């Protein structure tokens, strides 16, 4: 139901505790289960090297081993084997996760199933850039938080996994100024509402047709994800009904305005979001800064209006 939904995603993510004997996996996501044929229950507590076998290149393995020992980032395309014995090429990107405390205790790796073959396009590099965006975005999130130390541990990592959602959706659009933002936002809103909402919540989407670069899209997607999620989660706490609206309008000078509007409960007056808040508010401010954008908010029992102004003209310069 959600297993298949969450699983169809192209990124696969794992986290290992390299401080523990034999560097056991402590977390894997649904994509990993689908890709490898192993259940999460089966895999946690074991070193990920069970995916390797006959055709696995020792050179690549050594480089992974060296990277872990040197607390370094590494990227290899490696031959791996699923639970049913099926071989596949795995494009692996990994390196130290960086806690609040230690900078090298935990490692994260991402896996992209590249199918079978027994090469580099121009799509390949665009795809690879995304896997860096994923890892990179994950790192910023992690460094703010404090990795706790089974199910509750998984919830700390289920949340992380959830935010990379804009980027997994982006990879899919990419597989098919090159990103159709309106189309992309439509899939973002649907996914979010699918996860974070239900029945009595109406989600409207009004996007102009415009193509933008990948980096801009990935950034925008994550920005909108945070803010749109906030709407469905918070705006109707004490409310029986509501409406959320996402807009994306191209204005003059290639200035793009992205809006998220509630009619719900309103942001508390003491709280000056996103300057004040939880991890989300911090995420939003970073993404806003990387975009060179401006965010504004208007409060009250008539609802919450969020507006992000993004300069598509200055992206080249940036
Ligand atoms: N649409 C909204 N309506 C009412 N209150 C809101 C709304 N959006 C945010 N808030 C308030 O702002 C606070 C900060 O939210 P935020 O920083 O995004 O973290 P969070 O939504 O609580 N969970 P997370 O964002 O995933 O870390 C929330 O706890 C709410 O009290
Ligand atoms: C987080 C993490 C994920 C890994 N994922 C893979 C993988 O998907 N495929 C693989 O062949 N090796 C993987 N390795 C390498 C493997 O587990 C082991 O550390 C090295 O092969 C050293 O023997 C991973 C290592 C870490 C730390
Ligand atoms: Mg939030």
Per-residue DSSP letters for 62-130?
Answer: HHHHHHHHTT--EEEEEEEE-TTS-EEEEEEEEEEE--SS-SSSEEEEEEEE--------SHHHHHHHH
User: Residues 276, 164: one domain?
Assistant: no
Nearest 5 degrees, angle CA 32-CA 173-CA 286?
A: 80
Which ligand has its closest atom nearest to the C-alpha of 162?
Answer: 1
User: Residues 144, 256: one domain?
Assistant: no
Parent domain of 191:
177-318
The Cα–Cα gap between 312 and 255 comes to 6
User: Residue 217 — left, alpha, or beta (φ > 0 → left; ψ -120 to 50 → alpha)?
Assistant: alpha
User: Residues 152, 183: one domain?
Assistant: no
Taking CB atoms and a 6 Å cutoff, what residues make up the pocket around ligand 2? 14, 16, 23, 47-49, 51-52, 61, 64-65, 68, 78, 80, 90, 92, 94, 107-109, 111
User: Residues 203, 116: one domain?
Assistant: no
CATH number where 12 lies: 3.30.450.20
- Counted domains in the chain: 2
User: Residues 70, 218: one domain?
Assistant: no
The Cα–Cα gap between 51 and 48 comes to 6
User: Residues 147, 89: one domain?
Assistant: yes
Taking CB atoms and a 6 Å cutoff, what residues make up the pocket around ligand 1? 230-231, 233-235, 262, 264-268, 271, 273, 277-281, 304
Among the candidates 141, 176, 211, a domain finishes at 176
User: Residues 147, 4: one domain?
Assistant: yes
What are phi and psi for residue 247, nearest 5 degrees? -125, 145
Question: Strand, helix or coil at 17?
Answer: strand
61 CA closest ligand 2 atom index? 21
Q: What is the DSSP letter of 229?
A: H
261: its two tokens:
């509007």
Distance of CA 215 from the midpoint of ligand 2 (Å): 28
Distance of CA 6 from the midpoint of ligand 2 (Å): 23
Q: What are the residues facing 259 on neighbouring strands?
A: 247, 307
274: its two tokens:
């996103």
143: its two tokens:
């460094």
CATH number where 286 lies: 3.30.565.10
Other C-beta atoms within 10 Å of 24: how many?
A: 15
- Residue nearest ligand 1's atom 14 by CA: 277
The Cα–Cα gap between 24 and 35 comes to 19
78: its two tokens:
């490696």
Three state DSSP letters for 239-305 = CCCEEEEEEEEECHHHEEEEEEEECCCCCCCCCCCCCCCCHHHHHHHHHHHHCCCEEEEECCCCCCE
CA distances 279 to 86, 101, 104, 152, 270, Å, are: 40, 17, 22, 18, 18
Among the candidates 156, 176, 196, a domain finishes at 176
Q: What is the resolution of this structure in A?
A: 2.9
Contacts by 52-61 with C-beta closer than 8 Å and gap 24+? 52/78, 52/79, 52/80, 52/81, 53/79, 53/80, 53/81, 53/87, 55/79, 55/87, 56/80
Among the candidates 147, 176, 205, a domain finishes at 176
The Cα–Cα gap between 64 and 143 comes to 23
164: its two tokens:
């990379």
18 CA closest ligand 2 atom index? 27
Task: Judge whether 188 and 226 are in contact, CB under 8 Å.
Answer: no
Which method was used?
X-ray
- Residue nearest ligand 1's atom 30 by CA: 234
Which ligand has its closest atom nearest to the C-alpha of 273?
Answer: 1
User: Residues 237, 140: one domain?
Assistant: no
Which ligand has its closest atom nearest to the C-alpha of 79?
Answer: 2
Task: Judge whether 33 and 134 are in contact, CB under 8 Å.
Answer: no
User: Residues 84, 120: one domain?
Assistant: yes
Task: Judge whether 248 and 235 are in contact, CB under 8 Å.
Answer: no
76: its two tokens:
């290899």
Helix (H) or strand (E) holding 133: helix 123-144
- Residue nearest ligand 1's atom 9 by CA: 230
What is the secondary structure of 41-76 as a DSSP string?
Answer: HHHTTS-GGGG--TT--HHHHHHHHHHHHTT--EEE
What are phi and psi for residue 86, nearest 5 degrees? -65, 130
User: Residues 289, 315: one domain?
Assistant: yes
């Amino acid at each position: 139901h959600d297993k298949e939904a969450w699983g169809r995603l192209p990124f696969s993510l794992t986290i290992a505790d390299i401080s523990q004997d034999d560097e056991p996996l402590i977390y894997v996501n649904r994509a990993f289960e689908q890709m490898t044929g192993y259940s999460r229950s089966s895999v946690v507590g074991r070193n990920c090297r069970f995916l390797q076998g006959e055709k696995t290149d020792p050179g690549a393995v050594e480089r992974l081993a060296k990277a872990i020992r040197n607390c370094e980032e590494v990227e290899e395309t490696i031959y791996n084997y699923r639970a049913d014995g099926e071989g596949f090429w795995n494009h692996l990107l990994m390196g130290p996760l960086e806690d609040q405390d230690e900078k090298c205790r935990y490692f994260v790796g991402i896996q992209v199933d590249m199918g079978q073959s027994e090469r580099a396009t121009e799509l390949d590099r665009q795809l690879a850039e995304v896997q860096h965006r994923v890892k990179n975005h994950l790192a910023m999130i992690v460094s703010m938080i404090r990795i706790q130390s089974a199910g509750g541990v998984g919830s700390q990592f289920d949340s992380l996994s959830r935010r990379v959602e804009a980027l997994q959706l982006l990879y899919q659009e990419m597989d098919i100024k090159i990103i159709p933002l309106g189309a992309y936002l439509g899939r973002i809103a649907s996914a979010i509402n699918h996860i974070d909402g239900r029945g009595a919540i109406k989600v409207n989407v009004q996007a102009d047709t415009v193509d933008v670069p990948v980096e801009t899209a990935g950034r925008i997607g994550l920005l909108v994800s945070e803010v749109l999620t906030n709407a469905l989660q918070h705006a109707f706490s004490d409310r029986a009904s509501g409406v959320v609206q996402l807009r994306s309008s191209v204005m003059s000078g290639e200035q793009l305005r992205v809006t998220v509007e509630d009619d719900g409960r309103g942001i508390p007056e003491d709280c000056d979001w996103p300057n004040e808040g939880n991890l989300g508010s911090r995420i939003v401010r970073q993404l806003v800064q990387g975009l060179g954008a401006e965010l504004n908010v208007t409060r009250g029992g008539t609802g919450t209006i969020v507006n992000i102004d993004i300069p598509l003209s200055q992206q080249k310069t940036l």
